Amino acid sequence: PAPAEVQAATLEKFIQGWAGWTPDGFLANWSEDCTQKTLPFSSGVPLRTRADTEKLFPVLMSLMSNFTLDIHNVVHDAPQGKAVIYALTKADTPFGPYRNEHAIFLWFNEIGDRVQKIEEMFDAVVIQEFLPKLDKYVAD
Amino acid sequence: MPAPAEVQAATLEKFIQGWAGWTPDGFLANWSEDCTQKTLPFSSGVPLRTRADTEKLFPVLMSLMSNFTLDIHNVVHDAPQGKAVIYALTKADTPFGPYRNEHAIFLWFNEIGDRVQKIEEMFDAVVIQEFLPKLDKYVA
Numbered sequence: 401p402a403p404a405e406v407q408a409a410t411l412e413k414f415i416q417g418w419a420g421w422t423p424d425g426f427l428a429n430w431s432e433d434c435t436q437k438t439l440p441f442s443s444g445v446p447l448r449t450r451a452d453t454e455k456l457f458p459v460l461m462s463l464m465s466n467f468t469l470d471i472h473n474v475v476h477d478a479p480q481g482k483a484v485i486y487a488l489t490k491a492d493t494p495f496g497p498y499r500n501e502h503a504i505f506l507w508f509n510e511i512g513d514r515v516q517k518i519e520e521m522f523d524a525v526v527i528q529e530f531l532p533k534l535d536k537y538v539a540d
Numbered sequence: 541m542p543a544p545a546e547v548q549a550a551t552l553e554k555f556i557q558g559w560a561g562w563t564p565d566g567f568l569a570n571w572s573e574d575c576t577q578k579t580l581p582f583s584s585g586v587p588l589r590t591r592a593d594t595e596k597l598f599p600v601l602m603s604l605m606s607n608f609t610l611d612i613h614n615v616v617h618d619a620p621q622g623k624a625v626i627y628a629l630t631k632a633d634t635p636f637g638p639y640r641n642e643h644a645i646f647l648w649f650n651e652i653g654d655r656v657q658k659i660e661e662m663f664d665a666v667v668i669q670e671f672l673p674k675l676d677k678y679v680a
């Protein structure tokens with residue numbers, strides 16, 4: 401894997417792209433083959449490709465305003481090219497305040513300048529429930 | 541400063557082995573006497589467990605799940621920070637049907653590096669929080 405300081409720079413940019421709460425900014429640090437997989441595996445939530453995320457995050461980020469990201473724990477394994485972030489998110493929607501918490505497992509690419517794989521344990525009800533309901537709305 | 545990386549890694553290995561062994565004394569041998577456990581997410585408000593609390597828990601729990609298996613999916617070790625994360629999948633048989641769980645478990649080592657000092661654990665907490673205390677009503 402890449403040197404620790406190269407990986408660490410990517411890890412920091414990943415976090416600031418998330419905190420920036422824009423689709424292009426967040427995806428800037430994905431590799432081209434990067435995927436996101438919701439945990440636990442038992443929930444059977446389909447993998448998200450980079451393209452899936454480009455289509456999904458504009459509406460999702462528009463729904464949640466005043467987004468703030470609290471980084472509670474960062475664990476960086478430079479010899480393995482891996483990291484974990486525990487993050488707490490807060491936002492507003494018309495349905496009131498919004499909160500989530502994420503245990504996000506990251507793999508860096510070999511060059512070390514991108515995130516190549518994400519596995520994420522979080523409250524997935526929005527992508528599990530509310531999103532089959534948009535598929536049918538644009539279907540209608 | 542943190543313990544030697546090599547010792548932390550060995551403690552991580554032993555912690556996993558004590559978990560897999562599915563006995564109270566075997567698993568808690570790798571917890572410091574002051575070790576605490578915190579169920580994640582924080583929004584669930586589950587009170588911190590002391591080591592003593594956990595010593596009362598694990599006996600009847602481990603007694604109720606048979607053929608316990610522990611599969612280690614991901615280990616992320618930050619030796620400079622004296623921390624690690626494990627992603628693990630567990631299964632067991634119970635008289636009510638099969639048990640499955642998955643755990644994103646954040647660990648901190650003690651100064652010598654031969655014990656885990658602090659645990660924060662994202663997992664399905666329903667059995668511990670809902671099923672086990674229905675047996676607290678039984679005792680009384």
Ligand SMILES: COC(=O)c1cc(C)cc(O)c1C(=O)c1c(O)cccc1O
Pocket residue numbers: 418426457460461489500502504520522526527
């Ligand atoms: C627009 O979403 C993101 O930027 C996002 C970002 C990261 C690092 C993890 C996520 O899980 C999400 C997300 O998908 C999401 C969601 O699906 C529902 C609510 C809040 C969220 O942050």
